[PDB]
Ligand binder design. Structure first.
Ligand code: GHQ
Ligand code: GHQ
Lengths: 191, 191
């Protein structure tokens, strides 16, 4: 409960400044508690980011499980769009956590490992689906499915996050979904 | 001259530990000079990284100008491979600088702007070539050329650098060139 308060406060404060510029004291008063009461719920401001990013990533993950268990009744282009869109919408709704999470991969081993565990899972799911499409005679046996899936997933990570942070250069947010779908569909079905 | 010594020393020390863990004193003795003599050539260890990354990136840039002025006499797949290979070979030969440079984008505005200036130039060159291919009737008018070029360049940045750092996940270094060429050629020529 106070736990949700510290989390919401961190997400809000990260909408306006980096983690380096937010104090434990800043998070404490935000949730309406003392510095020492803060330390009962979290070991550090860094563990607060790790928890937010845990929640964002698991939300993406569950949303993609829900898609996998309940296929959308559509063509191959839309099957892939619906999947990429889990990442667009989920992270797109949590840009501050997304951006702060990505910078913490450099400094925090737990953040790096969390990102790494989920990226390995999403790449493995992507490759299994390409393999199914190949077994069905729907896609040609070009590159190793897992090598292809790895590059395409790395493209979506870099390209979504550049867009969300308004980096230069970046695809504009309103064009990025279509851009990625074109590259997935041409690279998975092209000869 | 002592300048080249500080640069070589920094590159060597970055083959073994991050910049955070290298002192000005560490760079100074490396080049066989005093701390204060160091400060005559460079304002900081951070300006030393900025200079290395300047050199790496300009080397990539000149190598791609040389390709553009002197076309390779080959099919479209090899034209693109020869281009992606400038980035593979150049950065691939300077992984420590590459990796330390990429982490410094987060903390250093000069590093971020340098990376941003060159990425904008390589994306602009990529789009002009796709446009030429389209004007020639060699590629179909699918996505906006600059949106396509931006995503494909962002894919090569993330995917090359994950490979070079042996990240998990990543395409293995010996498979990454072929992986990227397949995605460029299918996405640029596919309908
Ligand atoms: O879009 C994807 N991956 C991007 C994951 C991200 F953004 F890098 F975290 C994806 C799409 C369909 C099925 C599986 C994965
Ligand atoms: O491979 C490329 N871009 C990647 C640039 C990098 F790696 F991201 F720095 C490229 C290929 C052909 C022509 C122009 C650019």
């Amino acid at each position: 409960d106070r736990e949700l308060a510290i989390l919401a406060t961190a997400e809000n404060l990260l909408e306006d400044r980096p983690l380096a510029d937010i104090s434990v004291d800043d998070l404490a008063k935000g949730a309406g508690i003392s510095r020492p009461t803060f330390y009962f719920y979290f070991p550090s401001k860094e563990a607060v980011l790790l928890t937010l990013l845990d929640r964002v990533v698991n939300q993406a993950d569950m949303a993609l499980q829900t898609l996998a268990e309940n296929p959308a009744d559509t063509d191959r282009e839309n099957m892939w769009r619906t999947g990429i869109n889990v990442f667009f919408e989920t992270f797109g709704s949590h840009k501050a956590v997304t951006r702060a999470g990505q910078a913490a991969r450099a400094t925090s081993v737990e953040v790096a490992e969390l990102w790494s565990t989920f990226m390995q899972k999403w790449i493995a799911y992507t490759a299994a689906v390409i393999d199914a499409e190949r077994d069905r005679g729907a896609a040609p046996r070009t590159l190793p499915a897992h090598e292809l899936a790895t590059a395409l997933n790395l493209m979506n990570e870099r390209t979504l996050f550049a867009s969300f942070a308004g980096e230069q250069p970046s695809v504009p947010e309103a064009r990025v979904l279509d851009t990625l779908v074109h590259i997935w569909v041409t690279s998975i079905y092209g000869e």
